[PDB]
Design a protein around this ligand. Structure first.
Ligand SMILES: [Cl-]
Length: 291
Protein backbone atom coordinates (compact mmCIF):
# COMPACT_ATOMS: atom_id res chain seq x y z
CA UNK A 1 0.00 0.00 0.00
CA UNK A 2 0.76 3.26 1.49
CA UNK A 3 2.09 0.34 3.73
CA UNK A 4 4.54 -0.83 1.12
CA UNK A 5 6.07 2.63 0.81
CA UNK A 6 6.12 2.95 4.58
CA UNK A 7 7.98 -0.33 5.09
CA UNK A 8 10.56 0.64 2.46
CA UNK A 9 11.08 3.88 4.32
CA UNK A 10 11.29 2.13 7.67
CA UNK A 11 13.91 -0.35 6.40
CA UNK A 12 16.26 2.59 5.67
CA UNK A 13 16.41 3.19 9.41
CA UNK A 14 14.94 0.35 11.54
CA UNK A 15 15.89 2.32 14.68
CA UNK A 16 13.27 4.99 14.14
CA UNK A 17 9.57 4.64 13.40
CA UNK A 18 8.45 6.70 10.39
CA UNK A 19 6.33 9.73 11.33
CA UNK A 20 3.15 8.47 9.67
CA UNK A 21 3.26 5.02 11.30
CA UNK A 22 0.99 5.69 14.27
CA UNK A 23 -1.77 7.01 11.93
CA UNK A 24 -1.50 4.03 9.61
CA UNK A 25 -1.55 1.56 12.53
CA UNK A 26 -4.76 3.19 13.81
CA UNK A 27 -6.51 2.02 10.66
CA UNK A 28 -5.32 -1.54 11.08
CA UNK A 29 -2.19 -3.37 9.83
CA UNK A 30 -2.76 -5.63 6.82
CA UNK A 31 -2.87 -9.30 7.73
CA UNK A 32 0.00 -10.27 5.50
CA UNK A 33 2.26 -7.48 6.87
CA UNK A 34 1.58 -8.08 10.59
CA UNK A 35 4.31 -10.63 11.06
CA UNK A 36 6.94 -8.12 10.00
CA UNK A 37 5.28 -5.02 11.40
CA UNK A 38 4.63 -6.47 14.83
CA UNK A 39 8.30 -7.46 15.12
CA UNK A 40 9.47 -4.03 14.07
CA UNK A 41 7.00 -2.30 16.50
CA UNK A 42 8.30 -4.45 19.34
CA UNK A 43 11.95 -3.65 18.39
CA UNK A 44 13.03 -7.16 17.47
CA UNK A 45 14.56 -7.65 14.08
CA UNK A 46 16.73 -10.65 13.76
CA UNK A 47 17.04 -10.90 17.65
CA UNK A 48 19.52 -13.68 17.41
CA UNK A 49 20.09 -14.15 21.20
CA UNK A 50 16.52 -14.92 22.14
CA UNK A 51 16.28 -17.33 19.14
CA UNK A 52 19.48 -19.07 20.33
CA UNK A 53 18.08 -19.38 23.86
CA UNK A 54 14.71 -20.61 22.47
CA UNK A 55 16.41 -23.49 20.68
CA UNK A 56 17.81 -24.66 24.03
CA UNK A 57 14.72 -23.89 26.03
CA UNK A 58 12.64 -26.26 23.88
CA UNK A 59 14.77 -29.17 25.02
CA UNK A 60 13.79 -28.60 28.63
CA UNK A 61 10.82 -29.95 30.61
CA UNK A 62 8.07 -27.57 31.78
CA UNK A 63 6.96 -27.69 35.40
CA UNK A 64 3.57 -26.40 34.11
CA UNK A 65 2.67 -29.09 31.58
CA UNK A 66 -0.85 -29.51 32.91
CA UNK A 67 -1.86 -25.87 32.92
CA UNK A 68 -0.35 -25.43 29.47
CA UNK A 69 -2.13 -28.44 27.98
CA UNK A 70 -5.47 -27.33 29.48
CA UNK A 71 -5.08 -23.82 28.06
CA UNK A 72 -3.97 -25.05 24.61
CA UNK A 73 -7.04 -27.35 24.37
CA UNK A 74 -9.24 -24.22 24.72
CA UNK A 75 -7.08 -22.04 22.41
CA UNK A 76 -8.86 -21.54 19.09
CA UNK A 77 -9.33 -25.35 18.75
CA UNK A 78 -11.67 -25.05 15.78
CA UNK A 79 -9.42 -22.73 13.84
CA UNK A 80 -8.01 -24.25 10.60
CA UNK A 81 -4.43 -23.71 11.68
CA UNK A 82 -4.87 -25.28 15.18
CA UNK A 83 -7.62 -27.96 14.68
CA UNK A 84 -5.24 -30.80 13.66
CA UNK A 85 -3.74 -31.94 17.02
CA UNK A 86 -0.66 -33.23 15.09
CA UNK A 87 -0.28 -30.10 12.99
CA UNK A 88 2.56 -27.73 13.02
CA UNK A 89 0.48 -24.98 14.65
CA UNK A 90 -0.37 -26.91 17.73
CA UNK A 91 3.22 -28.25 18.00
CA UNK A 92 4.66 -24.71 17.84
CA UNK A 93 2.10 -23.42 20.34
CA UNK A 94 3.12 -26.04 22.91
CA UNK A 95 6.81 -25.35 22.40
CA UNK A 96 6.41 -21.56 22.82
CA UNK A 97 4.32 -21.90 25.95
CA UNK A 98 6.70 -24.48 27.51
CA UNK A 99 9.73 -22.44 26.57
CA UNK A 100 8.23 -19.35 28.17
CA UNK A 101 7.58 -21.25 31.40
CA UNK A 102 11.26 -22.10 31.54
CA UNK A 103 12.50 -18.64 30.44
CA UNK A 104 10.60 -16.72 33.08
CA UNK A 105 11.81 -18.52 36.16
CA UNK A 106 10.27 -16.06 38.57
CA UNK A 107 6.64 -16.19 37.26
CA UNK A 108 6.38 -19.04 34.75
CA UNK A 109 3.61 -19.59 32.23
CA UNK A 110 0.64 -17.30 32.87
CA UNK A 111 -2.99 -18.41 32.54
CA UNK A 112 -4.24 -17.42 29.13
CA UNK A 113 -0.87 -16.83 27.60
CA UNK A 114 -1.55 -19.52 24.98
CA UNK A 115 -4.15 -17.29 23.34
CA UNK A 116 -1.64 -14.49 22.91
CA UNK A 117 1.02 -16.96 21.69
CA UNK A 118 -1.49 -18.28 19.14
CA UNK A 119 -2.27 -14.77 17.88
CA UNK A 120 1.43 -14.24 17.23
CA UNK A 121 1.87 -17.68 15.54
CA UNK A 122 -0.97 -16.78 13.21
CA UNK A 123 1.26 -14.04 11.74
CA UNK A 124 4.93 -15.05 12.13
CA UNK A 125 7.09 -18.12 12.52
CA UNK A 126 7.55 -19.95 15.80
CA UNK A 127 10.94 -18.58 16.82
CA UNK A 128 9.86 -14.96 16.14
CA UNK A 129 6.53 -15.49 17.94
CA UNK A 130 8.48 -16.58 21.08
CA UNK A 131 10.66 -13.38 20.80
CA UNK A 132 7.62 -11.12 20.50
CA UNK A 133 5.87 -12.91 23.34
CA UNK A 134 8.86 -12.26 25.59
CA UNK A 135 8.87 -8.57 24.62
CA UNK A 136 5.14 -8.25 25.39
CA UNK A 137 5.59 -9.96 28.80
CA UNK A 138 8.78 -8.19 29.81
CA UNK A 139 9.22 -4.92 27.81
CA UNK A 140 5.54 -3.94 27.47
CA UNK A 141 4.96 -5.21 31.00
CA UNK A 142 2.26 -7.82 30.87
CA UNK A 143 3.98 -10.06 33.39
CA UNK A 144 3.77 -7.30 35.98
CA UNK A 145 0.04 -7.81 36.32
CA UNK A 146 0.75 -11.38 37.71
CA UNK A 147 3.20 -10.34 40.50
CA UNK A 148 2.33 -9.83 44.10
CA UNK A 149 -1.06 -11.64 44.05
CA UNK A 150 -2.16 -9.42 41.14
CA UNK A 151 -1.58 -6.08 42.93
CA UNK A 152 -0.90 -4.21 39.62
CA UNK A 153 -4.09 -5.69 38.13
CA UNK A 154 -6.04 -4.31 41.13
CA UNK A 155 -4.44 -0.96 40.30
CA UNK A 156 -5.72 -1.17 36.74
CA UNK A 157 -9.23 -1.95 37.99
CA UNK A 158 -9.13 1.20 40.14
CA UNK A 159 -7.84 3.21 37.23
CA UNK A 160 -10.59 1.87 34.90
CA UNK A 161 -13.28 2.79 37.43
CA UNK A 162 -11.90 6.36 37.92
CA UNK A 163 -11.87 6.76 34.09
CA UNK A 164 -15.45 5.48 33.91
CA UNK A 165 -16.53 7.98 36.64
CA UNK A 166 -15.07 10.63 34.38
CA UNK A 167 -16.00 9.50 30.84
CA UNK A 168 -18.99 7.19 31.33
CA UNK A 169 -20.58 8.67 34.52
CA UNK A 170 -24.00 7.12 34.03
CA UNK A 171 -22.57 3.64 33.74
CA UNK A 172 -20.24 4.18 36.72
CA UNK A 173 -23.20 5.30 38.81
CA UNK A 174 -25.26 2.27 37.85
CA UNK A 175 -22.47 -0.13 38.59
CA UNK A 176 -22.14 1.51 42.01
CA UNK A 177 -25.89 1.11 42.55
CA UNK A 178 -25.74 -2.65 41.76
CA UNK A 179 -22.30 -3.17 43.42
CA UNK A 180 -20.63 -4.46 40.30
CA UNK A 181 -16.87 -3.93 40.44
CA UNK A 182 -14.44 -4.15 37.60
CA UNK A 183 -12.81 -7.33 38.88
CA UNK A 184 -16.02 -9.09 37.99
CA UNK A 185 -15.78 -8.25 34.29
CA UNK A 186 -12.44 -6.77 33.15
CA UNK A 187 -9.89 -9.28 34.40
CA UNK A 188 -9.39 -11.17 31.07
CA UNK A 189 -9.33 -7.90 29.14
CA UNK A 190 -6.16 -6.89 31.00
CA UNK A 191 -4.53 -10.22 31.72
CA UNK A 192 -4.94 -11.58 28.15
CA UNK A 193 -5.12 -8.30 26.22
CA UNK A 194 -8.62 -9.40 24.98
CA UNK A 195 -7.13 -12.51 23.24
CA UNK A 196 -9.08 -14.93 25.36
CA UNK A 197 -12.68 -13.86 24.62
CA UNK A 198 -12.90 -11.52 21.58
CA UNK A 199 -13.06 -12.36 17.89
CA UNK A 200 -9.67 -12.66 16.13
CA UNK A 201 -10.34 -9.86 13.63
CA UNK A 202 -10.79 -7.39 16.45
CA UNK A 203 -8.02 -8.92 18.59
CA UNK A 204 -5.44 -8.48 15.77
CA UNK A 205 -6.31 -4.77 15.57
CA UNK A 206 -5.89 -4.49 19.33
CA UNK A 207 -2.37 -6.02 19.14
CA UNK A 208 -1.52 -3.65 16.27
CA UNK A 209 -2.43 -0.68 18.57
CA UNK A 210 -0.89 -2.18 21.68
CA UNK A 211 2.49 -2.91 20.06
CA UNK A 212 2.58 0.63 18.60
CA UNK A 213 1.29 2.69 21.55
CA UNK A 214 1.83 0.50 24.58
CA UNK A 215 -0.10 -1.62 27.08
CA UNK A 216 -2.20 1.39 28.16
CA UNK A 217 -4.37 0.94 25.09
CA UNK A 218 -6.28 -1.74 27.04
CA UNK A 219 -7.88 1.22 28.87
CA UNK A 220 -8.89 2.84 25.61
CA UNK A 221 -10.46 -0.34 24.32
CA UNK A 222 -12.15 -1.02 27.69
CA UNK A 223 -13.72 2.47 27.67
CA UNK A 224 -14.75 2.11 24.05
CA UNK A 225 -16.45 -1.22 24.73
CA UNK A 226 -18.29 0.11 27.87
CA UNK A 227 -19.38 3.34 26.12
CA UNK A 228 -20.60 1.49 23.04
CA UNK A 229 -22.70 -1.02 24.99
CA UNK A 230 -23.63 1.15 27.98
CA UNK A 231 -27.35 1.27 27.05
CA UNK A 232 -27.44 -2.55 27.23
CA UNK A 233 -25.88 -2.32 30.73
CA UNK A 234 -27.51 0.71 32.39
CA UNK A 235 -30.88 -0.90 33.12
CA UNK A 236 -29.57 -4.44 33.89
CA UNK A 237 -29.30 -6.03 37.30
CA UNK A 238 -26.12 -7.75 38.52
CA UNK A 239 -26.88 -11.08 36.84
CA UNK A 240 -28.00 -9.33 33.68
CA UNK A 241 -24.80 -7.28 33.41
CA UNK A 242 -22.67 -10.44 33.79
CA UNK A 243 -24.62 -12.33 31.20
CA UNK A 244 -24.13 -9.41 28.74
CA UNK A 245 -20.41 -9.32 29.32
CA UNK A 246 -20.15 -13.15 28.94
CA UNK A 247 -22.29 -13.78 25.82
CA UNK A 248 -23.62 -10.70 23.98
CA UNK A 249 -20.59 -8.44 24.22
CA UNK A 250 -18.07 -10.57 22.29
CA UNK A 251 -20.82 -11.61 19.83
CA UNK A 252 -21.34 -7.98 18.76
CA UNK A 253 -17.75 -7.85 17.49
CA UNK A 254 -18.06 -10.78 15.14
CA UNK A 255 -19.10 -7.99 12.71
CA UNK A 256 -16.03 -6.33 11.09
CA UNK A 257 -17.89 -3.06 10.80
CA UNK A 258 -18.69 -3.07 14.55
CA UNK A 259 -15.07 -3.86 15.33
CA UNK A 260 -13.74 -1.07 13.10
CA UNK A 261 -16.03 1.54 14.70
CA UNK A 262 -14.99 0.28 18.09
CA UNK A 263 -11.25 0.67 17.48
CA UNK A 264 -11.86 4.14 16.01
CA UNK A 265 -13.71 5.14 19.23
CA UNK A 266 -11.01 3.58 21.39
CA UNK A 267 -8.36 5.66 19.64
CA UNK A 268 -10.55 8.75 19.96
CA UNK A 269 -11.17 7.99 23.71
CA UNK A 270 -7.31 7.88 24.15
CA UNK A 271 -6.17 8.44 27.84
CA UNK A 272 -2.94 10.34 28.69
CA UNK A 273 0.00 8.86 30.54
CA UNK A 274 -0.22 11.83 32.91
CA UNK A 275 -3.80 10.99 33.86
CA UNK A 276 -3.08 7.26 34.27
CA UNK A 277 -0.05 8.02 36.51
CA UNK A 278 -2.20 10.32 38.66
CA UNK A 279 -4.71 7.57 39.26
CA UNK A 280 -1.88 5.01 39.89
CA UNK A 281 -0.45 7.37 42.56
CA UNK A 282 -3.96 7.76 44.16
CA UNK A 283 -4.34 3.95 44.33
CA UNK A 284 -0.86 3.52 45.87
CA UNK A 285 -1.57 6.23 48.49
CA UNK A 286 -4.87 4.55 49.39
CA UNK A 287 -3.26 1.11 49.70
CA UNK A 288 -0.55 2.55 51.98
CA UNK A 289 -3.18 4.03 54.34
CA UNK A 290 -5.12 0.76 54.72
CA UNK A 291 -1.78 -1.10 55.12
CL1 LIG B 1 -6.91 12.41 29.11
Amino acid sequence: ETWGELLSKWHLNLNVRPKQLSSLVRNGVPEALRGEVWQLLAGCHNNDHLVEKYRILITKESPQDSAITRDINRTFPAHDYFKDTGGDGQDSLYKICKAYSVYDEEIGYCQGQSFLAAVLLLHMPEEQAFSVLVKIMFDYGLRELFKQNFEDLHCKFYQLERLMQEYIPDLYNHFLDISLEAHMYASQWFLTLFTAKFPLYMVFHIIDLLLCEGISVIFNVALGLLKTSKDDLLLTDFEGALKFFRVQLPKRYRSEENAKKLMELACNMKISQKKLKKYEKEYHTMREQQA
